[PDB]
């Protein structure tokens, strides 16, 4: 059960991240290809190392998703100096095996993708030179998690800095909320007052 919900979320978050990367021009347009998921046009990256990086990131998270130990998955955008400008927070909440209800929930997720696709319509451009990162917030205190989250040796995870997180102001900009009996997730952006 709770296992397949993870596969879904993992499948989702993977696309979201690729789209976010395009839409915020974190990488150039020429490495992306248009595909379709969630019966929608997306941009996925054809750079294998980048793809591998993301797959890896999300293989690791999968197992915590199953136990509903994850509270947030945040994509973070960092500038040249190395300070977080934007953040795509995906806040998760989870409450006996379905079928159509599963595809319903899955299709819905397209509402989100479509927000990300046009979000630029509401954010202010980033400065040239940005990179990203993914942070996972646990409901409980990162550490039982710590042994479990190293699913892929060679892809290790550490504990976050105050550096990595920190960012006053910022500005909150909602994007989508959804509620099912089995999954609730809200995606919004926090966005440094001065990107410069």
């Amino acid at each position: 059960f709770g296992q397949v919900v993870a596969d879904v979320l993992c499948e989702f978050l993977e696309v979201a991240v690729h789209l976010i990367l395009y839409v915020r021009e974190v990488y150039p347009v020429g490495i992306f290809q248009k595909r379709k998921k969630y019966n929608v046009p997306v941009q996925m990256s054809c750079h294998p190392e980048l793809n591998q990086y993301i797959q890896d990131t999300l293989h690791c998270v999968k197992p915590l998703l199953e136990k509903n130990d994850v509270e947030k998955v945040v994509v973070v955008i960092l500038d040249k100096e190395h300070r977080p400008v934007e953040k795509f927070v995906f806040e998760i909440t989870q409450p006996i095996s379905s079928d159509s209800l599963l595809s319903h929930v899955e299709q819905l997720l397209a509402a989100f993708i479509l927000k990300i696709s046009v979000c630029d319509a509401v954010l202010d451009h980033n400065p040239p030179g940005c990179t990203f990162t993914v942070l996972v917030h646990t409901r409980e205190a990162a550490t039982r998690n710590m042994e479990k989250i190293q699913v892929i040796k060679d892809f290790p995870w550490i504990l976050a800095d105050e550096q990595d997180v920190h960012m006053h102001d910022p500005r909150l900009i909602p994007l989508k909320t959804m509620t099912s009996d089995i999954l609730k997730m809200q995606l919004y952006v926090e966005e440094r007052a001065h990107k410069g």
Partner: peptide, 21 residues
């Protein structure tokens, strides 16, 4: 407190340009 991140950073923009036309 509750916050994990991959040790590794993703491919830089430059690294990626080398492979494109």
């Amino acid at each position: 407190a509750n916050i994990l991140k991959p040790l590794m950073s993703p491919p830089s923009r430059e690294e990626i340009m080398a492979t494109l036309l």
